[PDB]
Scaffold this active site. Structure first.
Site, PDB file in Angstrom:
ATOM      1  N   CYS A   1      29.241  66.764  41.543  1.00 13.41           N
ATOM      2  CA  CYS A   1      30.300  67.732  41.847  1.00 13.41           C
ATOM      3  C   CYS A   1      30.653  67.667  43.328  1.00 13.41           C
ATOM      4  CB  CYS A   1      29.869  69.148  41.431  1.00 13.41           C
ATOM      5  SG  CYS A   1      28.627  69.864  42.524  1.00 13.41           S
TER       6      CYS A   1
ATOM      7  N   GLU B   1      20.821  66.232  42.489  1.00  9.58           N
ATOM      8  CA  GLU B   1      21.053  65.514  43.738  1.00  9.58           C
ATOM      9  C   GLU B   1      20.478  66.289  44.923  1.00  9.58           C
ATOM     10  OE1 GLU B   1      24.912  65.660  41.391  1.00  9.58           O
ATOM     11  OE2 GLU B   1      22.941  66.632  41.531  1.00  9.58           O
TER      12      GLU B   1
ATOM     13  N   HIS C   1      21.118  71.542  41.980  1.00  6.19           N
ATOM     14  CA  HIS C   1      21.588  70.288  41.378  1.00  6.19           C
ATOM     15  C   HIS C   1      20.590  69.187  41.650  1.00  6.19           C
ATOM     16  CE1 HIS C   1      26.184  71.232  40.523  1.00  6.19           C
ATOM     17  NE2 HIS C   1      25.336  72.007  39.809  1.00  6.19           N
TER      18      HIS C   1
ATOM     19  N   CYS D   1      27.698  68.681  46.138  1.00  8.30           N
ATOM     20  CA  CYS D   1      26.732  67.609  46.284  1.00  8.30           C
ATOM     21  C   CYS D   1      27.311  66.496  47.128  1.00  8.30           C
ATOM     22  CB  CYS D   1      26.303  67.104  44.917  1.00  8.30           C
ATOM     23  SG  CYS D   1      25.168  68.269  44.132  1.00  8.30           S
TER      24      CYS D   1
HETATM   25 ZN   LIG Z   1      26.195  69.032  42.466  1.00  8.17          ZN
END
Ligand SMILES: [Zn+2]
EC number: 3.5.4.38
Length: 186
Positions: free
Chosen positions: A93, A64, A62, A96
């Site tokens: 999400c 992030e 991800h 993260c």
């Molecule tokens: Zn995430």
């Protein structure tokens, strides 16, 4: 570990950050950042850039996570206060959220604010609680408004000196999303 891009092309910005509708065809997440280093009441450093990822990927890929792994080098310098701002196209999400909470627990000289264009899977309780958890950690989570989209246009886009042009319903969608976020973060 992945380096950030410098900027998005204007076509990508307008597509990826559009604040819906419902944005079915958005299976990427794009993330713009600013990092400001402050030492003895003065700016010692300023870094900006963009990470992205697919909505298909393992959670550890991800955007992030890429930011967090990239930022944790000498890019962090133990004695300095860091202000990190993210502008994300889909809200983050649960995992993260967890990783950020661990990251900030780890690095106590870092602050974080997240502006998000759209609220991801927000009817379901997991994604709401991920946001609540960031808020509890003391991370500001905000919906992008007009000046936030313009700010991104002006900092993260190969805009060719052309001005930011809002899409129809930008402001309408902002208010709807802001109402939904507010309701969910009490
Ligand atoms: Zn995430």
């Amino acid at each position: 570990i992945r380096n950030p891009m410098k900027a998005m092309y204007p076509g990508t910005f307008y597509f990826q950050f559009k604040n819906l509708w419902e944005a079915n065809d958005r299976n990427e997440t794009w993330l713009c950042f600013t990092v400001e280093g402050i030492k003895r009441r003065s700016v010692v450093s300023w870094k900006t850039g963009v990470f992205r990822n697919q909505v298909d990927s393992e959670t550890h890929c991800h955007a992030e996570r890429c930011f967090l792994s990239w930022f944790c080098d000498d890019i962090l310098s133990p004695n300095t206060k860091y202000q990190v701002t993210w502008y994300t196209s889909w809200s983050p999400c649960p995992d993260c959220a967890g990783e950020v909470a661990e990251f900030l627990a780890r690095h106590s000289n870092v602050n974080l604010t997240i502006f998000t264009a759209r609220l991801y899977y927000f009817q379901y309780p997991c994604y709401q609680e991920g946001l609540r958890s960031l808020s509890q950690e003391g991370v500001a989570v905000e919906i992008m408004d007009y000046e936030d989209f313009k700010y991104c246009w002006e900092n993260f886009v190969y805009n060719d000196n052309e001005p930011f042009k809002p899409w129809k319903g930008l402001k309408t969608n902002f208010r709807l999303l802001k109402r939904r976020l507010r309701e969910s973060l009490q």
